[PDB]
């Protein structure tokens, strides 16, 4: 067994579940467990480093970590007992503390964490003789110095396969081209390229900042998300407006079937963001009420649209979508980002930030659930899409995405295009 002075620290302030896993604890207890000298929990360490700002500030974490590095022995130890305490507890704790700081800087750093007094205290710590005897001491100094002068401490892979030839040469399109002058497969490719580029800019920190808000402890910009949501709203506005610009119902039905084919080709490309944005416009009130136009729709196109709507049934928890996303793997994919947000929003509002309303009993299990959800967004940044970009179509989409009115404003256009009886 272990002598009494070589046991863990602050463990009486940990709270465990049925399986024995940590469900909660105090700031001191959680950090003590993060730098435990006897055992190492990689899963705990990963969840804590990702979610720590929702539980404590950077300055509190650094202070608690430095206090662990400078841990004092309990009073009354004999000289021999103290030497054993140094070799078996303090020095292992110092290794854990330094390695945790390395992981914090290398894999769990948000620029919003920047705090010059904390960094300068941290830097002073890294300069200390006791830290400099470790090899990582010079690396800690190098990281903190770069963070202090504004420097930053990845891209999805594209296979060596030949890209498919673009189905619509940009030079063949007129200066003011019609949408259906673009091959629907090629439009799906270009929608997939712009959506995936916007998707890869979304960090986990931005997701935590959008859902948790001020409790996240992240002043990170959610601009990556707002641009991604803007692109989906614009694609939905664009789809409805291209339909409502056509005056002949026999021409509106061709535009709709064109967009059904686009959304379906996006589904084949594992681009569920653009596909959901397209069908949401088709099911929107201004387009859904075009009874004279849908009378022309072939059963084949209607089935494909219904199947895509069954796939992304929000009222049925996206059940079929979840079953399909589970088997993507290494294939490139633009997921429907709305599912991540709702999952995160559900666990943020369904679980308390504290256990039994005790401020010193932080609900760590709530952070663990959130960590498992938000970490999924990285699964689909591993491999990118091998599609040749057509700038003429990219500029064409940029122009219309800004010009189109909202779906709500398009309701009046629908009422004039097909009046009520």
Tab-separated table of C-alpha atoms in Angstrom:
chain	number	residue	atom	x	y	z
A	1	UNK	CA	0.000	0.000	0.000
A	2	UNK	CA	0.913	3.698	-0.203
A	3	UNK	CA	2.145	5.669	2.846
A	4	UNK	CA	-0.289	8.309	4.045
A	5	UNK	CA	1.761	11.305	2.876
A	6	UNK	CA	2.017	9.887	-0.675
A	7	UNK	CA	-1.743	9.865	-1.329
A	8	UNK	CA	-3.714	12.174	-3.604
A	9	UNK	CA	-4.744	15.743	-2.863
A	10	UNK	CA	-8.172	17.366	-2.411
A	11	UNK	CA	-9.871	14.060	-3.283
A	12	UNK	CA	-12.474	14.645	-0.556
A	13	UNK	CA	-13.785	17.461	-2.795
A	14	UNK	CA	-14.275	15.156	-5.790
A	15	UNK	CA	-17.726	13.763	-6.579
A	16	UNK	CA	-18.024	10.391	-8.307
A	17	UNK	CA	-20.796	8.590	-10.171
A	18	UNK	CA	-21.891	4.943	-10.106
A	19	UNK	CA	-19.057	3.802	-12.384
A	20	UNK	CA	-16.540	5.698	-10.240
A	21	UNK	CA	-15.877	8.370	-12.862
A	22	UNK	CA	-15.571	11.989	-11.756
A	23	UNK	CA	-18.920	13.748	-12.092
A	24	UNK	CA	-17.905	16.903	-10.225
A	25	UNK	CA	-15.525	18.660	-7.900
A	26	UNK	CA	-13.966	21.926	-6.837
A	27	UNK	CA	-11.458	23.944	-8.851
A	28	UNK	CA	-8.682	22.746	-6.535
A	29	UNK	CA	-9.801	19.109	-6.678
A	30	UNK	CA	-10.163	19.006	-10.468
A	31	UNK	CA	-6.694	20.499	-10.985
A	32	UNK	CA	-5.198	18.150	-8.388
A	33	UNK	CA	-6.685	15.260	-10.363
A	34	UNK	CA	-5.445	16.825	-13.617
A	35	UNK	CA	-1.900	16.628	-12.196
A	36	UNK	CA	-2.251	13.468	-10.114
A	37	UNK	CA	1.109	11.816	-9.462
A	38	UNK	CA	-0.228	8.253	-9.067
A	39	UNK	CA	-2.662	7.911	-11.990
A	40	UNK	CA	-3.170	9.613	-15.352
A	41	UNK	CA	-6.635	9.973	-16.902
A	42	UNK	CA	-6.149	11.034	-20.521
A	43	UNK	CA	-9.912	11.318	-21.031
A	44	UNK	CA	-10.280	13.585	-17.996
A	45	UNK	CA	-7.248	15.646	-19.035
A	46	UNK	CA	-8.582	16.147	-22.561
A	47	UNK	CA	-12.056	17.183	-21.382
A	48	UNK	CA	-10.659	19.538	-18.735
A	49	UNK	CA	-8.198	21.288	-21.053
A	50	UNK	CA	-10.921	21.877	-23.649
A	51	UNK	CA	-13.620	23.081	-21.235
A	52	UNK	CA	-11.632	24.688	-18.402
A	53	UNK	CA	-12.668	28.269	-19.206
A	54	UNK	CA	-16.296	27.329	-18.475
A	55	UNK	CA	-15.148	26.343	-14.962
A	56	UNK	CA	-12.324	28.770	-14.099
A	57	UNK	CA	-10.306	31.576	-15.626
A	58	UNK	CA	-6.906	31.097	-17.223
A	59	UNK	CA	-5.368	32.938	-14.279
A	60	UNK	CA	-7.012	30.580	-11.804
A	61	UNK	CA	-5.797	27.543	-13.751
A	62	UNK	CA	-2.230	28.871	-13.897
A	63	UNK	CA	-2.273	29.822	-10.206
A	64	UNK	CA	-3.606	26.378	-9.270
A	65	UNK	CA	-1.060	24.660	-11.528
A	66	UNK	CA	1.817	26.724	-10.121
A	67	UNK	CA	0.666	25.927	-6.581
A	68	UNK	CA	0.842	22.242	-7.533
A	69	UNK	CA	4.382	22.662	-8.873
A	70	UNK	CA	5.264	24.379	-5.572
A	71	UNK	CA	3.388	21.875	-3.396
A	72	UNK	CA	4.677	21.757	0.166
A	73	UNK	CA	5.034	18.563	2.214
A	74	UNK	CA	2.638	18.021	5.119
A	75	UNK	CA	3.972	19.126	8.479
A	76	UNK	CA	5.720	16.585	10.674
A	77	UNK	CA	7.403	14.380	8.071
A	78	UNK	CA	10.750	12.926	9.050
A	79	UNK	CA	13.825	13.579	6.923
A	80	UNK	CA	13.654	10.134	5.309
A	81	UNK	CA	9.877	10.428	4.881
A	82	UNK	CA	10.391	13.830	3.248
A	83	UNK	CA	12.968	12.517	0.765
A	84	UNK	CA	10.502	9.812	-0.273
A	85	UNK	CA	7.804	12.476	-0.612
A	86	UNK	CA	10.113	14.420	-2.938
A	87	UNK	CA	10.960	11.448	-5.159
A	88	UNK	CA	7.534	9.788	-5.306
A	89	UNK	CA	5.066	12.705	-5.128
A	90	UNK	CA	6.416	16.252	-5.630
A	91	UNK	CA	8.707	15.617	-8.599
A	92	UNK	CA	6.108	13.454	-10.434
A	93	UNK	CA	3.556	16.223	-9.817
A	94	UNK	CA	5.978	18.742	-11.340
A	95	UNK	CA	6.294	16.574	-14.451
A	96	UNK	CA	2.504	16.398	-14.752
A	97	UNK	CA	2.191	20.173	-14.289
A	98	UNK	CA	4.748	20.988	-16.985
A	99	UNK	CA	3.285	18.472	-19.434
A	100	UNK	CA	-0.213	19.847	-18.802
A	101	UNK	CA	1.048	23.348	-19.609
A	102	UNK	CA	2.560	21.958	-22.811
A	103	UNK	CA	-0.738	20.352	-23.839
A	104	UNK	CA	-2.573	23.536	-22.856
A	105	UNK	CA	-0.420	25.629	-25.196
A	106	UNK	CA	-0.004	23.137	-28.036
A	107	UNK	CA	-3.475	21.609	-28.387
A	108	UNK	CA	-5.923	23.590	-26.219
A	109	UNK	CA	-5.092	27.264	-26.731
A	110	UNK	CA	-7.677	29.891	-27.635
A	111	UNK	CA	-6.517	33.381	-28.572
A	112	UNK	CA	-9.390	34.729	-26.460
A	113	UNK	CA	-7.458	33.388	-23.450
A	114	UNK	CA	-4.902	36.185	-23.924
A	115	UNK	CA	-4.290	37.967	-20.626
A	116	UNK	CA	-0.980	39.812	-20.366
A	117	UNK	CA	-0.646	39.733	-16.533
A	118	UNK	CA	-1.357	35.989	-16.497
A	119	UNK	CA	1.075	35.319	-19.353
A	120	UNK	CA	3.829	37.392	-17.739
A	121	UNK	CA	3.394	35.607	-14.408
A	122	UNK	CA	3.326	32.327	-16.333
A	123	UNK	CA	6.442	33.391	-18.262
A	124	UNK	CA	8.243	34.310	-15.036
A	125	UNK	CA	7.381	30.815	-13.780
A	126	UNK	CA	8.768	29.155	-16.914
A	127	UNK	CA	12.019	31.116	-16.476
A	128	UNK	CA	12.527	29.746	-12.958
A	129	UNK	CA	15.468	27.458	-12.228
A	130	UNK	CA	13.154	24.703	-10.973
A	131	UNK	CA	11.329	24.739	-14.312
A	132	UNK	CA	14.506	25.086	-16.401
A	133	UNK	CA	15.899	21.739	-15.187
A	134	UNK	CA	13.189	20.109	-17.304
A	135	UNK	CA	13.693	19.963	-21.061
A	136	UNK	CA	10.240	21.464	-21.687
A	137	UNK	CA	11.202	24.577	-19.709
A	138	UNK	CA	12.803	26.191	-22.746
A	139	UNK	CA	9.794	25.241	-24.878
A	140	UNK	CA	7.339	26.793	-22.412
A	141	UNK	CA	9.354	30.024	-22.506
A	142	UNK	CA	9.368	29.966	-26.311
A	143	UNK	CA	5.585	29.521	-26.436
A	144	UNK	CA	4.759	32.247	-23.914
A	145	UNK	CA	7.122	34.788	-25.481
A	146	UNK	CA	5.424	34.269	-28.847
A	147	UNK	CA	1.964	34.573	-27.288
A	148	UNK	CA	3.045	37.848	-25.664
A	149	UNK	CA	4.124	39.400	-28.986
A	150	UNK	CA	0.871	38.386	-30.686
A	151	UNK	CA	2.145	35.298	-32.507
A	152	UNK	CA	0.136	32.105	-32.966
A	153	UNK	CA	1.342	28.740	-31.676
A	154	UNK	CA	-4.079	21.464	-40.160
A	155	UNK	CA	-5.648	21.904	-43.586
A	156	UNK	CA	-7.830	18.973	-44.716
A	157	UNK	CA	-6.003	16.616	-47.055
A	158	UNK	CA	-6.964	16.269	-50.724
A	159	UNK	CA	-6.079	12.958	-52.422
A	160	UNK	CA	-3.573	12.648	-55.249
A	161	UNK	CA	-6.439	11.567	-57.525
A	162	UNK	CA	-7.165	13.600	-60.635
A	163	UNK	CA	-9.991	16.102	-60.064
A	164	UNK	CA	-13.122	15.591	-62.170
A	165	UNK	CA	-13.454	17.929	-65.119
A	166	UNK	CA	-15.861	20.818	-64.409
A	167	UNK	CA	-19.149	20.128	-66.170
A	168	UNK	CA	-19.635	23.824	-67.045
A	169	UNK	CA	-16.652	25.797	-68.316
A	170	UNK	CA	-16.662	29.298	-66.865
A	171	UNK	CA	-15.860	30.790	-70.270
A	172	UNK	CA	-19.087	29.321	-71.699
A	173	UNK	CA	-21.264	31.270	-69.243
A	174	UNK	CA	-22.463	34.707	-70.305
A	175	UNK	CA	-21.804	37.861	-68.298
A	176	UNK	CA	-25.359	37.580	-66.903
A	177	UNK	CA	-25.946	33.806	-66.882
A	178	UNK	CA	-29.087	31.957	-65.917
A	179	UNK	CA	-28.822	29.530	-63.011
A	180	UNK	CA	-29.865	26.542	-65.107
A	181	UNK	CA	-27.092	27.415	-67.561
A	182	UNK	CA	-24.943	25.774	-64.867
A	183	UNK	CA	-24.967	21.981	-64.790
A	184	UNK	CA	-26.725	21.002	-61.569
A	185	UNK	CA	-23.872	18.624	-60.701
A	186	UNK	CA	-21.349	21.438	-61.155
A	187	UNK	CA	-23.432	23.799	-59.021
A	188	UNK	CA	-23.480	21.174	-56.263
A	189	UNK	CA	-19.680	20.946	-56.522
A	190	UNK	CA	-19.234	24.711	-56.206
A	191	UNK	CA	-21.744	24.936	-53.354
A	192	UNK	CA	-19.856	22.106	-51.641
A	193	UNK	CA	-16.517	23.893	-52.094
A	194	UNK	CA	-17.656	27.202	-50.596
A	195	UNK	CA	-19.601	25.539	-47.766
A	196	UNK	CA	-16.733	23.239	-46.797
A	197	UNK	CA	-14.247	26.122	-46.787
A	198	UNK	CA	-16.556	28.014	-44.420
A	199	UNK	CA	-17.102	24.882	-42.315
A	200	UNK	CA	-13.391	24.255	-41.712
A	201	UNK	CA	-13.024	27.704	-40.115
A	202	UNK	CA	-15.441	26.761	-37.304
A	203	UNK	CA	-13.523	25.944	-34.121
A	204	UNK	CA	-14.798	24.167	-31.026
A	205	UNK	CA	-14.142	27.365	-29.060
A	206	UNK	CA	-16.626	29.234	-31.261
A	207	UNK	CA	-19.280	26.553	-30.710
A	208	UNK	CA	-18.803	26.805	-26.948
A	209	UNK	CA	-18.932	30.597	-27.180
A	210	UNK	CA	-22.183	30.576	-29.158
A	211	UNK	CA	-24.066	28.037	-27.031
A	212	UNK	CA	-22.674	28.659	-23.538
A	213	UNK	CA	-22.241	32.410	-23.975
A	214	UNK	CA	-20.697	34.232	-21.031
A	215	UNK	CA	-20.431	31.009	-19.016
A	216	UNK	CA	-18.018	29.603	-21.621
A	217	UNK	CA	-15.271	31.980	-20.508
A	218	UNK	CA	-14.387	32.416	-24.197
A	219	UNK	CA	-14.245	35.899	-25.701
A	220	UNK	CA	-13.597	34.078	-28.989
A	221	UNK	CA	-15.332	35.460	-32.058
A	222	UNK	CA	-18.239	33.320	-33.243
A	223	UNK	CA	-17.718	34.950	-36.636
A	224	UNK	CA	-16.849	31.584	-38.195
A	225	UNK	CA	-20.323	30.359	-37.231
A	226	UNK	CA	-22.142	33.548	-38.229
A	227	UNK	CA	-20.564	33.385	-41.686
A	228	UNK	CA	-21.512	29.712	-42.015
A	229	UNK	CA	-25.106	30.405	-40.963
A	230	UNK	CA	-25.169	33.421	-43.296
A	231	UNK	CA	-24.130	31.199	-46.212
A	232	UNK	CA	-26.949	28.749	-45.452
A	233	UNK	CA	-29.535	31.521	-45.092
A	234	UNK	CA	-28.352	33.086	-48.357
A	235	UNK	CA	-28.524	29.732	-50.147
A	236	UNK	CA	-32.081	29.292	-48.864
A	237	UNK	CA	-33.017	32.831	-49.936
A	238	UNK	CA	-31.299	32.276	-53.293
A	239	UNK	CA	-33.236	29.074	-54.023
A	240	UNK	CA	-36.626	30.615	-53.298
A	241	UNK	CA	-35.882	33.776	-55.263
A	242	UNK	CA	-34.652	32.018	-58.411
A	243	UNK	CA	-37.992	30.193	-58.390
A	244	UNK	CA	-40.085	33.333	-57.858
A	245	UNK	CA	-38.320	35.290	-60.624
A	246	UNK	CA	-39.798	32.931	-63.230
A	247	UNK	CA	-43.237	34.027	-64.431
A	248	UNK	CA	-44.347	30.841	-66.218
A	249	UNK	CA	-45.339	28.014	-63.826
A	250	UNK	CA	-43.985	25.512	-66.369
A	251	UNK	CA	-40.648	27.312	-65.968
A	252	UNK	CA	-40.814	27.464	-62.166
A	253	UNK	CA	-41.266	23.685	-62.100
A	254	UNK	CA	-38.041	23.325	-64.101
A	255	UNK	CA	-36.125	25.504	-61.634
A	256	UNK	CA	-37.468	23.514	-58.675
A	257	UNK	CA	-36.566	20.157	-60.226
A	258	UNK	CA	-33.150	21.658	-61.009
A	259	UNK	CA	-32.658	22.529	-57.332
A	260	UNK	CA	-33.979	19.116	-56.273
A	261	UNK	CA	-31.250	17.607	-58.450
A	262	UNK	CA	-28.698	19.999	-56.926
A	263	UNK	CA	-29.703	19.095	-53.368
A	264	UNK	CA	-29.617	15.396	-54.252
A	265	UNK	CA	-26.143	15.681	-55.772
A	266	UNK	CA	-25.062	17.460	-52.583
A	267	UNK	CA	-26.443	14.491	-50.637
A	268	UNK	CA	-24.292	12.173	-52.752
A	269	UNK	CA	-21.308	14.438	-51.970
A	270	UNK	CA	-22.009	14.107	-48.210
A	271	UNK	CA	-22.829	17.842	-48.203
A	272	UNK	CA	-25.818	17.857	-45.868
A	273	UNK	CA	-25.480	21.587	-45.175
A	274	UNK	CA	-26.275	22.767	-48.709
A	275	UNK	CA	-28.857	20.011	-49.191
A	276	UNK	CA	-30.796	21.035	-46.077
A	277	UNK	CA	-30.587	24.709	-47.056
A	278	UNK	CA	-32.050	23.948	-50.490
A	279	UNK	CA	-34.956	21.762	-49.362
A	280	UNK	CA	-35.829	24.179	-46.555
A	281	UNK	CA	-36.482	26.785	-49.244
A	282	UNK	CA	-38.540	24.300	-51.266
A	283	UNK	CA	-40.655	23.547	-48.184
A	284	UNK	CA	-40.869	27.231	-47.230
A	285	UNK	CA	-44.253	28.969	-47.294
A	286	UNK	CA	-43.661	31.096	-50.450
A	287	UNK	CA	-42.591	28.067	-52.497
A	288	UNK	CA	-44.804	25.428	-50.863
A	289	UNK	CA	-47.970	27.385	-51.724
A	290	UNK	CA	-47.206	27.414	-55.487
A	291	UNK	CA	-49.982	24.908	-56.109
A	292	UNK	CA	-50.216	25.612	-59.847
A	293	UNK	CA	-46.493	24.895	-60.223
A	294	UNK	CA	-46.302	21.676	-58.183
A	295	UNK	CA	-49.091	20.236	-60.357
A	296	UNK	CA	-46.403	19.907	-63.054
A	297	UNK	CA	-43.861	18.139	-60.835
A	298	UNK	CA	-43.059	14.565	-61.835
A	299	UNK	CA	-43.483	11.835	-59.231
A	300	UNK	CA	-39.768	11.007	-59.434
A	301	UNK	CA	-38.676	14.524	-58.441
A	302	UNK	CA	-41.299	14.657	-55.682
A	303	UNK	CA	-40.111	11.364	-54.177
A	304	UNK	CA	-36.483	12.496	-54.123
A	305	UNK	CA	-37.510	15.723	-52.378
A	306	UNK	CA	-39.622	13.891	-49.789
A	307	UNK	CA	-36.816	11.408	-49.085
A	308	UNK	CA	-34.361	14.249	-48.479
A	309	UNK	CA	-36.921	15.854	-46.162
A	310	UNK	CA	-37.385	12.562	-44.304
A	311	UNK	CA	-33.592	12.369	-43.995
A	312	UNK	CA	-33.451	15.789	-42.292
A	313	UNK	CA	-36.697	15.608	-40.306
A	314	UNK	CA	-36.181	18.099	-37.478
A	315	UNK	CA	-39.411	17.060	-35.734
A	316	UNK	CA	-38.024	13.492	-35.638
A	317	UNK	CA	-34.617	14.433	-34.164
A	318	UNK	CA	-32.838	14.021	-37.536
A	319	UNK	CA	-32.916	10.292	-36.799
A	320	UNK	CA	-32.150	9.118	-40.333
A	321	UNK	CA	-29.472	11.803	-40.722
A	322	UNK	CA	-27.762	10.628	-37.521
A	323	UNK	CA	-27.814	7.027	-38.753
A	324	UNK	CA	-26.150	8.090	-42.019
A	325	UNK	CA	-23.558	10.460	-40.529
A	326	UNK	CA	-22.383	7.601	-38.293
A	327	UNK	CA	-20.911	5.830	-41.358
A	328	UNK	CA	-19.131	8.672	-43.174
A	329	UNK	CA	-15.556	7.884	-42.162
A	330	UNK	CA	-12.708	9.271	-44.259
A	331	UNK	CA	-14.990	10.519	-47.042
A	332	UNK	CA	-15.270	14.327	-47.262
A	333	UNK	CA	-18.421	15.686	-45.662
A	334	UNK	CA	-20.116	18.989	-44.857
A	335	UNK	CA	-22.474	18.105	-41.979
A	336	UNK	CA	-25.652	19.948	-41.077
A	337	UNK	CA	-24.246	22.263	-38.420
A	338	UNK	CA	-27.692	22.849	-36.897
A	339	UNK	CA	-27.651	19.383	-35.321
A	340	UNK	CA	-24.451	20.157	-33.396
A	341	UNK	CA	-25.871	23.421	-32.035
A	342	UNK	CA	-29.142	21.864	-30.857
A	343	UNK	CA	-27.315	18.954	-29.209
A	344	UNK	CA	-25.029	21.431	-27.441
A	345	UNK	CA	-27.957	23.695	-26.547
A	346	UNK	CA	-29.856	20.733	-25.098
A	347	UNK	CA	-27.065	19.664	-22.754
A	348	UNK	CA	-26.241	23.255	-21.760
A	349	UNK	CA	-29.815	23.945	-20.610
A	350	UNK	CA	-30.628	20.398	-19.459
A	351	UNK	CA	-27.823	20.128	-16.900
A	352	UNK	CA	-26.819	22.452	-14.046
A	353	UNK	CA	-23.466	24.197	-13.997
A	354	UNK	CA	-23.113	23.131	-10.342
A	355	UNK	CA	-24.036	19.981	-8.433
A	356	UNK	CA	-26.655	20.333	-5.673
A	357	UNK	CA	-26.353	24.133	-6.041
A	358	UNK	CA	-22.915	24.078	-4.374
A	359	UNK	CA	-20.615	26.589	-6.065
A	360	UNK	CA	-17.560	24.516	-5.079
A	361	UNK	CA	-19.107	21.429	-6.746
A	362	UNK	CA	-18.644	22.167	-10.451
A	363	UNK	CA	-20.606	19.760	-12.637
A	364	UNK	CA	-17.729	18.198	-14.576
A	365	UNK	CA	-20.045	15.646	-16.213
A	366	UNK	CA	-21.833	18.488	-18.016
A	367	UNK	CA	-18.502	19.529	-19.534
A	368	UNK	CA	-17.747	15.913	-20.468
A	369	UNK	CA	-21.017	15.540	-22.390
A	370	UNK	CA	-20.445	18.877	-24.131
A	371	UNK	CA	-16.867	17.841	-24.943
A	372	UNK	CA	-18.024	14.641	-26.658
A	373	UNK	CA	-20.539	16.534	-28.806
A	374	UNK	CA	-18.409	19.490	-29.902
A	375	UNK	CA	-15.406	17.260	-30.668
A	376	UNK	CA	-17.398	15.674	-33.498
A	377	UNK	CA	-17.076	18.739	-35.730
A	378	UNK	CA	-13.391	17.877	-36.194
A	379	UNK	CA	-14.159	14.426	-37.634
A	380	UNK	CA	-15.193	15.998	-40.954
A	381	UNK	CA	-12.150	18.274	-41.330
A	382	UNK	CA	-9.733	15.404	-42.028
A	383	UNK	CA	-10.156	15.119	-45.815
A	384	UNK	CA	-11.265	17.806	-48.251
A	385	UNK	CA	-13.142	17.855	-51.537
A	386	UNK	CA	-11.170	17.257	-54.742
A	387	UNK	CA	-13.209	19.551	-56.983
A	388	UNK	CA	-11.881	22.116	-59.428
A	389	UNK	CA	-13.168	25.529	-58.374
A	390	UNK	CA	-14.987	27.483	-61.086
A	391	UNK	CA	-14.473	31.188	-60.255
A	392	UNK	CA	-17.232	32.311	-62.637
A	393	UNK	CA	-19.785	30.300	-60.658
A	394	UNK	CA	-18.269	31.401	-57.332
A	395	UNK	CA	-18.609	35.079	-58.267
A	396	UNK	CA	-22.099	34.425	-59.633
A	397	UNK	CA	-23.167	32.890	-56.314
A	398	UNK	CA	-21.529	35.719	-54.352
A	399	UNK	CA	-23.552	38.306	-56.277
A	400	UNK	CA	-26.956	36.660	-55.883
A	401	UNK	CA	-26.433	35.599	-52.255
A	402	UNK	CA	-26.275	39.292	-51.336
A	403	UNK	CA	-29.080	40.503	-53.631
A	404	UNK	CA	-31.812	38.049	-52.661
A	405	UNK	CA	-34.502	39.088	-50.154
A	406	UNK	CA	-35.428	36.995	-47.145
A	407	UNK	CA	-37.858	34.087	-47.349
A	408	UNK	CA	-40.319	36.213	-45.363
A	409	UNK	CA	-40.170	39.033	-47.919
A	410	UNK	CA	-40.596	36.453	-50.698
A	411	UNK	CA	-44.053	35.562	-49.351
A	412	UNK	CA	-45.481	38.719	-50.928
A	413	UNK	CA	-43.803	37.850	-54.237
A	414	UNK	CA	-45.497	34.446	-54.099
A	415	UNK	CA	-48.876	36.055	-53.362
A	416	UNK	CA	-48.594	38.163	-56.514
A	417	UNK	CA	-47.146	35.341	-58.623
A	418	UNK	CA	-50.013	33.023	-57.608
A	419	UNK	CA	-52.832	34.866	-55.817
A	420	UNK	CA	-55.114	33.232	-53.288
A	421	UNK	CA	-58.567	32.055	-54.329
